[PDB]
Design a protein around this ligand. Structure first.
Ligand SMILES: CCCCC[C@H](CC(=O)NO)C(=O)N[C@H](C(=O)N1CCC[C@H]1CO)C(C)C
Ligand code: NI
Length: 151
């Protein structure tokens, strides 16, 4: 493993929508493994590939032990229901926090390391984290959805 450098907002790679993953290869596996530990070391509950300088639709979330890490490749949100309002920060904007409204329930379709397609349903905080990461894969930063920044 390697502790990847997390890209901060002073950077164009953060707004570049990502390309889909095509070759589910060893290098993709190493990317995910390095991302998960790098994320955890930095106290994040999620991380997207553009945050480590890679413009591929790859992300990982790990908000609870039971659930555990959930790697997402080429994810798309098939459905959303209800809404939730709450505080969000981002590893690419250290120190910045704002109020953000997201869907409460989400149904997601994504691929694992071997390219197999699975279906995941989430809600509350895990659904928020997932939406935040999926935004990153499309070049969208939370800053564009902040209702107000906190004092
Ligand atoms: C909540 C939405 C998902 C956030 C994902 C980010 C990591 C990230 O930037 N991913 O792209 C994170 O872990 N953010 C943390 C965060 O926002 N937290 C941690 C506790 C709850 C919330 C408080 O704002 C801190 C590290 C800034
Ligand atoms: Ni972020």
């Amino acid at each position: 493993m390697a502790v990847l450098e997390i890209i901060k907002h002073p950077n164009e790679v953060l707004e570049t929508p990502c390309e889909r993953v095509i070759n589910f290869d060893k290098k993709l596996v190493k990317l995910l493994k390095d991302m998960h530990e790098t994320m955890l070391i930095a106290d994040g509950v999620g991380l997207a590939a553009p945050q480590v300088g890679v413009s591929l639709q790859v992300a990982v979330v790990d908000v609870d032990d039971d659930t555990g890490k959930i790697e997402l490749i080429n994810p798309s949100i098939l459905e959303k229901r209800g809404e939730q309002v709450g505080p969000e920060g981002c590893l690419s904007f250290p120190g910045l926090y704002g109020e953000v409204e997201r869907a409460d329930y989400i149904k997601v379709r994504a691929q694992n390391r071997r390219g197999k397609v699975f279906l995941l349903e989430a809600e509350g905080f895990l659904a928020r984290a997932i939406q935040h990461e999926i935004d990153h894969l499309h070049g969208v930063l939370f800053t564009s959805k902040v209702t107000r920044y906190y004092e």
